[PDB]
Design a protein around this ligand. Sequence first.
Ligand SMILES: [Zn+2]
Lengths: 52, 122, 133, 97, 88, 50, 52, 50, 84
Amino acid sequence: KAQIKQALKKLYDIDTVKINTLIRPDGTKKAFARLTPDVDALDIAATKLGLV
Amino acid sequence: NGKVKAGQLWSKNKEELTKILGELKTELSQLRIQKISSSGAKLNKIHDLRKSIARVLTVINAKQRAQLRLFYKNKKYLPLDLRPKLTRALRRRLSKEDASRVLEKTKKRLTHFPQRKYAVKA
Amino acid sequence: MKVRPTVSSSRRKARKAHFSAPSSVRRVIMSAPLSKELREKYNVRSIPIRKGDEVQIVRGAHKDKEGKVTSVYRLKYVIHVERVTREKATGQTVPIGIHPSNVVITKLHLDKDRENILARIKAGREQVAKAKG
Amino acid sequence: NNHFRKHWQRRVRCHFDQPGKKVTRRLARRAKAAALAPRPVDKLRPIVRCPTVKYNRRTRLGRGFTLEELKAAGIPRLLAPTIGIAVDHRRKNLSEE
Amino acid sequence: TKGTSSFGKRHNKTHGLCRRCGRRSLHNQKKVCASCGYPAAKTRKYNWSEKAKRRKVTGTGRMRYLSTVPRRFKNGFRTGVPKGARGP
Amino acid sequence: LRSKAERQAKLAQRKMNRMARQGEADRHIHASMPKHLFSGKRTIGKTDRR
Amino acid sequence: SEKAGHQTSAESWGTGRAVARIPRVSGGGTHRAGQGAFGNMCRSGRMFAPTK
Amino acid sequence: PSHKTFRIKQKLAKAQKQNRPIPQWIRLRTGNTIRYNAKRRHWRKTRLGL
Amino acid sequence: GKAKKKGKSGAARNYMTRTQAVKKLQLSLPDFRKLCIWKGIYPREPRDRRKVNKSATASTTFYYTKDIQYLLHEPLLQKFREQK
RNA sequence: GGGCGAGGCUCCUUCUGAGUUCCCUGGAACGGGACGCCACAGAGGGUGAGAGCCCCGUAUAGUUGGAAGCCAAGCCUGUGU
RNA sequence: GAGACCGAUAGCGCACAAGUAGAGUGAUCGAAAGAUGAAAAGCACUUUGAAAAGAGGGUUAAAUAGCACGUGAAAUUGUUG
RNA sequence: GUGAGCCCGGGUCGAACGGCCUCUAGUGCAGAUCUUGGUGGUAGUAGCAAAUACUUCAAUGAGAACUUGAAGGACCGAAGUGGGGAAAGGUUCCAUGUGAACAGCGGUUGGACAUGGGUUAGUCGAUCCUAAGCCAUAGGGAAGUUCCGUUUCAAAGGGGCAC
RNA sequence: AAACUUUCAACAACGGAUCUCUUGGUUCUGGCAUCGAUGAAGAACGCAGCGAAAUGCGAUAAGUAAUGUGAAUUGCAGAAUUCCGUGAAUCAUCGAAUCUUUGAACGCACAUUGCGCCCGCCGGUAUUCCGGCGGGCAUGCCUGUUCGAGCGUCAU
Ligand SMILES: [Zn+2]
């Protein structure tokens, strides 16, 4: 979780309040990163991630 | 774009190579998101970015090892990865000088009575 | 009759090597003769074929058809010549595979590597003829 | 008188490599001659008489010349093996002939 | 009741996965592999099983380092680069 | 080409459908001649089955 | 090859009421199991008087 | 079970990723001999043996 | 996570007594005092000295653990050993 | 006692002869017939059917370019503590 | 590099994604399975069927070669006489 | 042709093969409760009968006893045909779609097939502790793989003070 | 008379024999000496735009460098190659590198992605806290170094 939040901060200037992780049935890890209330996750997904 | 040739890489220094590597990693990271968001001809670009990253890392490692070999040129003890590999038995083999050492009595006998060149008439 | 001990006359090994040759060997295997004019111009009998060469078919049902080489399918040991095609059921055009030893090269696709190939083959030919003469 | 009561099939030596071994031996002899030229390919051997009452009628080649023979011929024992003469320190000369 | 009725009580494991050889032959109570003999240093093999020897002999796997040795021998275990080659 | 690929995929199933397998993952080889049914004799003491 | 026909584990099922007393490949789960072995009349057996 | 070790779950993940039919473009290659996945696994047919 | 134990972090990790510093550097007392004077290692005062050492008194000298770690790499140690 | 060393050998590399001439059968000549040619090469394989001359190779001397060793005709010198 | 060897029930267990698939708690046991055609030219289009397919009509030298595919014996079966 | 066999015609087929004299052998089948593979009669036969039981309308669909909705009739009857877990399995879970095969009939349905999705912890377990027990170390056996040994016939280490 | 059963024939089935083929075995001969703590053989897990396997490879992952050749690869998609070139290719060669988790397997363990210790570097308010990164820490034995122990033998 610490590495994931540091990588998110280094890559996208994303600040997270908490990060939950699981390991999927296919063997890759999935992380839910909840952002700080000041920033907008929809805005981040539209601009930085291109997830529209 | 996205294809970096080794010929221009071999003339750069460490700082420029690291800076180029940082750019290539950044564009590959964004391009993976663009891949999972939509399909296009940019899969070629991600492939060339991967190969360019491999090229830059190879050039950096080669320049570092050349500098280290120059540094350790005139030293008794070398790092194990810079020592020659050969095989384990070849490394354990007696050196040529030690294998060719002879005793003083043998040296005297070889000095005064070596194997002569000769022919026999018929 | 073969003489040298490194030469094998095994049919099994020869067919294995031919049908599992890599691409650079298959290029040499897919060689084609030159026309009479090109042979007298360059003192060269045969060359490996390549895309962009102009050939004339001298064997098979498509004899006396001429055209540029549009594809060298080395995996199938075959070349594709433009307008030497057939129709499928639907009427769509599919190329017909021609083995390169059934054609003759009429116009070489010329670049400096090809001139180097022709020059060294020619020089070897005159050197061998002069030495044996 | 057939000694086949052991597992004899495990220890059968055929000799299909007889012409190949002759070819290999001839190649080795040619290489040794080329390496040793212009010296002869072998060493000079003495004449000895075969032991026992069955074979003492016949003479043959021995291992090497004696130290007494080298001394009477005027050839030093350190020079002798370097000019193609075999030396045998065990053999003695019990008789003058 | 020694047959079908007794087979219903089979829900334990004598053997688990061995770390050295990967087979399901690691005795869970003895901590000893029936196949390869882990954790003994030697790999277990016997001359009364030629088939078992040939199942695991050298060449049945990847030969990650050993397959490059004959080429290096053929070129004489040389070092360096070709003369005039591009590089550092 | 998609229709051709689908037809080839369906034609690859003909032998396994004739053998009546439940998909390609059904590769069970049953015992046609079991030893307990084709060996031994029925003595006068304990028998192997009822 | 001197080992041909003999690289198999097989034993006879004995005198009985059903099958012949040729040795049969042990085990199970495959087509080879229960099949005749080692005989010169057997498929995948050893030839009579093997050539030397 | 629900309780499982990481090693066991990694092997199960690899088995889940291997469990698939072959892509249909495999059959259209030049000189193809693959007609189906001969190593296909199903949870009712053959045990993983872990 | 796993529960921390008492006395494994904080001032206990921050400070070291003179006895502990001398034993860590494997020096004699005159050599240690000489090296401290020469390298500028100064005595420090924890807020609660019992958290660092339970036998510490008002005359116990404390040093920074990082300062003693820095003293571990001083080349004068090998000079001391060579002279001895 | 030292130092040169012509030259030779070993291993990779460039290169090598001659019909796709005419008729018939055939979907396709690599078959049949006629006229030639090469051959220190008529081993083998490929090419739409049995191909020396369509293609790769095959025989033989050599002939480009390169590296590391070994052998070696001889030639310079020190001289006896 | 070769053979007075074997030619897919033979020859290695394996000419094929074979020490594979599969079986056994385990040590271990361990198969079956090659061939359309020169070239996919692997059947456009019409029509009947829900579909699988059928019928016309092409492709091919040949579909009496239709990805059940060279040849296609016997046991055994259907129709016709 | 006495015979084992040999030869020819017709049909099918598609790339090699035969006669004569010598040489050579893994060289000739009806049997071995053979070996492997394939196929019959039996035979459209024996059955497909434990666990009380099904019915109406509508929809879907090429096709509906065993799909769905509604309408009824029944059963489990709280030591359950209920609600959750340990072992074991490993995606069978959920959504959408579906030819064949499988669901000893049928199937539009499915734990089948195809493509995707789904498992979020400082507080729940693991992780820590020791139990019965097992394995290193010292040391002693054993040709040896290794056996005993687990506190021993071990120099088996912690703390403090110092002008 | 038909049906049924059987016999004979033609065509059609069933089945895969026969014939022809062979990138495979089998046997013989000739040449060569080269695994591993500088981490082998073996195992696991991963890597392709579109792969489950086989093949190749190791987070530089169907591959990088270098040398040579000289225009492909090909099932689809997408791009090529200034073709008069630092250059395609599932090419060949191969001297430079990368080489996950393991395994003789080495901090202690391992049925755990468990628990440590030492030394640096970086980041987050940070002398104390949190996190990341790098280099190390097995055993037997040899040579040397340095620190020691014992009235064991002595000198003073
Ligand atoms: Zn094991």
